[PDB]
Amino acid sequence: QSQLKLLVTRGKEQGYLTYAEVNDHLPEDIVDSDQIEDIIQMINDMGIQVMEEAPDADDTDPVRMYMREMGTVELLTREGEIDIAKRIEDGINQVQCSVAEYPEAITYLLEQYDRVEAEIDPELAREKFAELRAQYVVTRDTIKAKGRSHATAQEEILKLSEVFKQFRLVPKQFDYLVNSMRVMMDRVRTQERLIMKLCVEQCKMPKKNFITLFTGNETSDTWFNAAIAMNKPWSEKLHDVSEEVHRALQKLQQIEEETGLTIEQVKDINRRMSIGEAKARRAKKEMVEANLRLVISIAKKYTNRGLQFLDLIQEGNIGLMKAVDKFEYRRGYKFSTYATWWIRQAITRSIADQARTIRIPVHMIETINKLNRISRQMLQEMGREPTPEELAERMLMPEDKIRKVLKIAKEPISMETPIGDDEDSHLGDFIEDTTLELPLDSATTESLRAATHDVLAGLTAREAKVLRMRFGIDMNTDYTLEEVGKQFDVTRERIRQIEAKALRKLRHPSRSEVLRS
Amino acid sequence: LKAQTKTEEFDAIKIALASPDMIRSWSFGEVKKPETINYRTFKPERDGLFCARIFGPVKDYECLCGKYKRLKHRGVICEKCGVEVTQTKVRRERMGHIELASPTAHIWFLKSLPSRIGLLLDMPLRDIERVLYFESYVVIEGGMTNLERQQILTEEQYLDALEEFGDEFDAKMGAEAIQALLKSMDLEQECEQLREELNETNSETKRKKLTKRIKLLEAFVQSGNKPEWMILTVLPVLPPDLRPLVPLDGGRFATSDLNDLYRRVINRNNRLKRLLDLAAPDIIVRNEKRMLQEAVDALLDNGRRGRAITGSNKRPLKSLADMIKGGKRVDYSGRSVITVGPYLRLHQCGLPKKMALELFKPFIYGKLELRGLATTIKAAKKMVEREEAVVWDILDEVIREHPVLLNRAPTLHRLGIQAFEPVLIEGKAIQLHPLVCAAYNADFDGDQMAVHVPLTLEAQLEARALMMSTNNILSPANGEPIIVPSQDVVLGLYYMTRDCVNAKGEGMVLTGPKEAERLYRSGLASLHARVKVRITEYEKDANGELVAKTSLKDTTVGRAILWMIVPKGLPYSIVNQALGKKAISKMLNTCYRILGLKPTVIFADQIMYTGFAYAARSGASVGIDDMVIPEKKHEIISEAEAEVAEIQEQFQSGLVTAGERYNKVIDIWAAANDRVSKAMMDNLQTETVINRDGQEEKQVSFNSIYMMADSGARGSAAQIRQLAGMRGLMAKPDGSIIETPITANFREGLNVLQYFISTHGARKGLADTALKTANSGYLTRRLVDVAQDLVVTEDDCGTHEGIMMTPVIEGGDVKEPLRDRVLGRVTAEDVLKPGTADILVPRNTLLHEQWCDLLEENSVDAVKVRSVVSCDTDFGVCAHCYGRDLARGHIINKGEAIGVIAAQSIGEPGTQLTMRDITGGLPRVADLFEARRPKEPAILAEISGIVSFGKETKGKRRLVITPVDGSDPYEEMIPKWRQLNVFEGERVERGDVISDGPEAPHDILRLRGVHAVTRYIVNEVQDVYRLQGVKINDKHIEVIVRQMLRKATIVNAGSSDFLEGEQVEYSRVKIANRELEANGKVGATYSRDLLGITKASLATESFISAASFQETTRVLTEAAVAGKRDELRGLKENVIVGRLIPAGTGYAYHQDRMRRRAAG
Ligand SMILES: [Mg+2]
Ligand SMILES: [Zn+2]
Ligand SMILES: [Zn+2]
């Protein structure tokens, strides 16, 4: 209605395309650099019909749209923060406990420790690892002995779990273990999904029957032969997959022997581990989502220094994302300041490198800033400009080091810079090419080849070849007096004699003479 | 069994979308680091924007580290660093790519007038398509319940609908969401169902969007491009050399902005990749994705939305698109200040010694080494660097018959660049022949011209056979001579006539040449008397040859001696009996038409020599007593001021209308100005008394100034009238006229007041000149852009129809005849004769045979003539239908370049056009060519019927006229405003006037006829040149109007889809191939459509040609969408590619290659 009627009725056709008119007769926040092109595109060119393509199409900013989703405060208090942090520690604990349940994680740690000793107190390592190994070898015996039907044996197992929970592993180690268990589980469900895909679809066995049958042992062939001997219509098809199912069961039993665990519970421990992961991850996400304000607030001070606002607040977000990981609620120190440092370090360790086109090390950046901070006083504490010699004198560095330092400053200048203000000038247009050779020079080089190729013609074979091979021309790889003296019997001095005699021959011709210059 | 896999000759180029794998095909590696050059070693980093392994090595043949150096390993890569050691130009041609994490929308295919990604998907651009991919409002990707297929949801709506159903209508948000949208879209099935739905019971209430989108979808699906490529997942990288960072002077590197862009996008992309592996907060990751979008869009094309800044410069960064959206320097060239060279011929120019020495450097080298002297090439260099006498003689050998073409700054027409034979001159200025000094519009105020050296053999022959001055005798615009003698020489030959009575006269008779001896030996004067001599004339007829004719005519000394210059033929004597004025050019013209090129050329040199010499002998000057004022000046001034005094007194006592007494008193001073002007001229014209024999007689003043005026030589009535008479009515900044004209004149003193009044005229004069000078070229550009593609081809077609040519007669009420507009024109068919026979069918009206059109009396003033307006040609112009008008006397050679020469000739005299029911001037010309509707368009009767009122103001309304007869009615709309011209009941014809006002060219073409509308345009555009007094042939106007009527509109039913407005090119060629193909009913009838220069030029086949003038960002985009290909016949697009031009010396090449591209 408003926009359409005004635009159409007015522009008929506004003669000189009066742009500075209807752009004020539009709503929303003005002075944008976005809506402009959408008006200079419709008026002319595809006239008449374009004015009908405009309304039908008419029927914004990164930061402003970022503050929008950040608007969802969900702010916290000391109670809230400690709560979330508590959930984090709870999740982490359940995960680590789930790792303790895994015996192969313990035995692998044992194996890799023996690898460590086979090449942080060395005796302390030999101490704790001895404790772990001791509890393991005592718990291991209480397994096949079956004394105390996994009641008190379970107590020794859980005590072994506690012993394992005493070890403070490295992030790479924990991740490797967890990933190993998930890959193991990947093979487990690989075999299970294999058996199911083969028996259910290929053999036309209903999913009800497969869940009723397979869920039992899942390893022994007691369920498979009982599925075949059920005399069902889908039992006769199982014969065409007997070897496949057998292979899957044999491999799953192999996994049972690998983990040394009950196959009907590995899903349980892996499940709880997954539960812990999701919980801790969720809680940590809530943390970083909550302290989102701190990032932008402190990032505001670092603005305008070779990196835009979004990039800064982004490095601050990842800085905060790192701060949340290393923190506990059982600490007198709050999160508001501890996170602040990690954020400052995060963005300052980004502005340091990824700012200028050319590389630069941190010490360089610090030295440069220090030089600036010092220089701003010499011209203010005296009255005249700061001389480079005196400015270098007030520092530990000599002077030439500072000279070379200033040759690294600035982006620097871009080619698209206007200069003479012609029609229209560009700095990069005055930059001459030097890697190319003059056509004159190339012509002289070609004529040089011809000249030499014609000069070695007035020579003998045992002299042309000598000069040619010695100074290496028209044969790539040049040889020495020995490699030429061997292929011509007489060695060294003889070939050098001839080599000089040819040069003696070149004292009258003028061709190469003028080609010299 | 060809199928070659090398870089051979190409017949066409193709443009289309690029698949991610298509990008990988160009990828010689992947940029992974924002690093450019080392901070210390200044050496290319590993996988940065300037890698050596990916792109190319720094030095020519040595690798990065230095394990391999010379040409030993030019095919093998290095062991320590995989750097292919070839050239350094490799670094200029190597591509490379970046593979982004989450998908990114291409800024062009996103927001470029019509949303290509939107219109293809049928979805709002900056409204919905923005909010759904900027992570705000989730969109659906096809649902089989409750939700449609492309609706927009909020997070709340998302979870609500997900709770209601879910796990069976999953639809993401953002870039990859739009990707799944375009990917899921079935172009084929939609192309069918859309055709089904958008045709069922719908009038003109829907057909618009229907036909539009269906044509668009059919185009895209047939293009071959998959909509998946619309938003890219792999972004290619520009070669390093095309965006280098080269160290300037003493450090301070110089880089391109693209490095900043690529560095930013790389950084943001890497952070995104890192965040998609670490903790993944939805707000953080989605924000970084939007930031990646920002970086990518900023790199591809800034435009457009705020403009990414940085780089310390407060100015934006030059993105890729900005480097290809919107002067060809050349070697073997130079320039210098020009100077007159009287001793030269017409085919020669003064080229400075040192200048020509440096120019023909390589030629001097070759010739030196060829003869001897220089033992080698470098010897020649050292030999010319040390200018050693003999080298100059060698130079005299190399420039012998090696043409050099000269050029002036403002190149309006073809005669801007003309070739000459280089003549070495001891000096540092470039000398020019004073005859061709007018074609350049060049003066010697200090103007400077440039010189070019035709290097190629055929380039030298092109300059000699085409651009040589001796071949450019006649102007391409009008058949009249262009190298015609100017001021100095004409005043000379004017002085070589001018019969003065007695004064060492008497009729002492002799025989031509002997008179020369008489003149040098004094005794007799020169301008007497008259005197008689024996003239041996030469004429030819029928069987050509030559026929002598000795007689005794009464000429003068000047005419006698001047007769020696006149060539063999010509009517003789009578051409000299006149004087020197305009016949000075007429004589040259007739000489050319009855003799030929050479005789005319040598005649031109001779008349130039003669004019200069005798002008110098005359010694005409300009003393203060040369501009004599009239004695009646003060009288007339007093009388005029008396009359105006009475009028002012009358105004004082009421009586006369004081409101407009201003106008009538202006008429008083205007009359007085004409009185002083007439008095001054009648005085300064005749005067004198002499004393013939018995004394007492009168001739015409020998008053220098008058001699200059009565013989061209820059001296007009108005200027002289201001010199001795008076400067008339002066303009006022208001636009009004001052009621106190400059009574005084330049011969007299000028008061401070009236000078401060005249300063306005001078100011607005110079200012207006500065405007129309640029405005003229501004029009020329549009003319060329629309016309520079048609060239005379297919020899001479058939057809007879063509506009009936008739003398432009304003003589209806003002008397003004012009009947030379038919000459060198090819006749339609035997245009009758008051009796029988006469004119043949295709006989081109000769220059002597148009003079035969006067032997058929004043009765025959109408002849049908073939024109470029008609001509049943396809993609060119019939040689016959065109004409012949060139510097050449014959018809245009097959494969010329009619378009550009036409445009040039039209926009050349634009410099002398005064901008403003009569607009008049250059603006009038522009409006006529643009075919714009007037501010008060008249109305015509579409079908002949009976005029009657259709409900007196019953709408709406506003009157209504309804001419109904025979069958079916029509209801035109009259808006009360403006009256009428036909009462009720009266009958009208097909296209009668019923508004008596300005006519609209659209209505004329649509109803009256093509011959009528073209006749209108030419006869209306000429009328604005009549007033300005600029001669220009109608052929060129007809030429631009030809392709001004390029496209039409079909209205019926054929293989072409109705509503589509297409050019009569494809139309005619397809209707000719349908009447005898299967059935004439599978095709419709078209209708010519009038469209302006800009609207016509806007449409063109090649996308490169379009990418030249019109908005590149648009044309390149839309041409990218539909798999288009230029192949490849246009001039402009074949110019920027740098190949042979499909015209002139080319054409033959294009024809051979064109037929060659018929095998496959
Ligand atoms: Mg000048
Ligand atoms: Zn190497
Ligand atoms: Zn024709």
From Swiss-Prot, chain A:
Example of a GO MF term: sigma factor activity
Annotated stretches, region: Interaction with anti-sigma factors: 492-507
Chain positions covered by the region annotation Sigma-70 factor domain-4: 455-508
Region (Sigma-70 factor domain-3): 366-442
Any Gene Ontology biological process: negative regulation of DNA-templated transcription
GO terms for cellular component: cytosol; cytosolic DNA-directed RNA polymerase complex; sigma factor antagonist complex
Chain location of the short sequence motif Interaction with polymerase core subunit RpoC per the record: 311-314
Swiss-Prot/TrEMBL site (Interaction with anti-sigma factors) positions: 470
DNA-binding region: 481-500
CDD domains: Sigma70_r4 (cd06171)
Keyword terms, alphabetized: Cytoplasm, DNA-binding, Sigma factor, Transcription, Transcription regulation
Region annotation (Sigma-70 factor domain-2) ranges: 287-357
Region ranges (Sigma-70 factor domain-1): 1-59
InterPro entries reported for this sequence: RNA_pol_sigma-70_dom (IPR014284), RNA_pol_sigma70 (IPR000943), RNA_pol_sigma70_r1_2 (IPR009042), RNA_pol_sigma70_r2 (IPR007627), RNA_pol_sigma70_r3 (IPR007624), RNA_pol_sigma70_r4 (IPR007630), RNA_pol_sigma_70_non-ess (IPR007631), RNA_pol_sigma_70_r1_1 (IPR007127)
Cited Pfam families: Sigma70_ner (PF04546), Sigma70_r1_1 (PF03979), Sigma70_r1_2 (PF00140), Sigma70_r2 (PF04542), Sigma70_r3 (PF04539), Sigma70_r4 (PF04545)
Cell compartments where the protein resides: Cytoplasm
Subunit structure: Interacts transiently with the RNA polymerase catalytic core formed by RpoA, RpoB, RpoC and RpoZ (2 alpha, 1 beta, 1 beta' and 1 omega subunit) to form the RNA polymerase holoenzyme that can initiate transcription. Identified in a complex containing RpoD, the RNA polymerase subunits RpoA, RpoB and RpoZ, CRP and DNA. Interacts with Rsd; this prevents interaction with the RNA polymerase catalytic core and with promoter DNA, and as a consequence, promotes transcription from promoters that require alternative sigma factors. (Microbial infection) Interacts with Escherichia phage lambda antitermination protein Q.
Domain commentary: Contains 4 domains, connected by flexible linkers. In the active conformation, the domains are in an extended conformation, each making extensive interactions with the RNA polymerase catalytic core.
Family note: Belongs to the sigma-70 factor family. RpoD/SigA subfamily.
Summary of the function given for this chain in its UniProt record: Sigma factors are initiation factors that promote the attachment of RNA polymerase to specific initiation sites and are then released. This sigma factor is the primary sigma factor during exponential growth. Preferentially transcribes genes associated with fast growth, such as ribosomal operons, other protein-synthesis related genes, rRNA- and tRNA-encoding genes and prfB.
Name of the featured protein: RNA polymerase sigma factor RpoD
Species, as recorded: Escherichia coli (strain K12)
From Swiss-Prot, chain B:
Outcome after substituting residue 487 to P: Resistant to antibiotics salinamide A and B
Reported biotechnological use: Co-administration of salinamide and rifampicin or salinamide and myxopyronin suppresses the emergence of resistance to both antibiotics.
Binding site for Zn(2+) 2: 797, 871, 878, 881
Cross-referenced PANTHER family: DNA-DIRECTED RNA POLYMERASE, DNA-DIRECTED RNA POLYMERASE SUBUNIT BETA
Catalytic activity: RNA(n) + a ribonucleoside 5'-triphosphate = RNA(n+1) + diphosphate
Cofactor(s) it depends on: Mg(2+); Zn(2+)
Mod. after translation: Acetylated on several lysine residues in the presence of glucose.
UniProt key word Lipid biosynthesis: no
Outcome reported for the amino acid change (mutating residue 741 to S/T): Resistant to antibiotics salinamide A and B
Protein name from the UniProt record: DNA-directed RNA polymerase subunit beta'
Residues reported in the UniProt entry to bind Mg(2+): 443, 445, 447
Taxonomic source organism: Escherichia coli (strain K12)
Enzyme Commission number(s) from the entry: 2.7.7.6
UniProt cross-references to Gene3D superfamilies, sorted A to Z: 1.10.132.30, 1.10.150.390, 1.10.1790.20, 1.10.40.90, 2.40.40.20, 2.40.50.100, RNA polymerase II, clamp domain, RNA polymerase Rpb1, domain 3
Species lineage: Bacteria, Pseudomonadati, Pseudomonadota, Gammaproteobacteria, Enterobacterales
Origin: domain of life: Bacteria
A Gene Ontology biological process term: submerged biofilm formation
Subunit description: The RNAP catalytic core consists of 2 alpha, 1 beta, 1 beta' and 1 omega subunit. When a sigma factor is associated with the core the holoenzyme is formed, which can initiate transcription. The rRNA transcription and antitermination complex (rrnTAC) consists of RNAP, NusA, NusB, NusE (rpsJ), NusG, SubB, ribosomal protein S4, DNA and precursor rRNA; S4 is more flexible than other subunits.
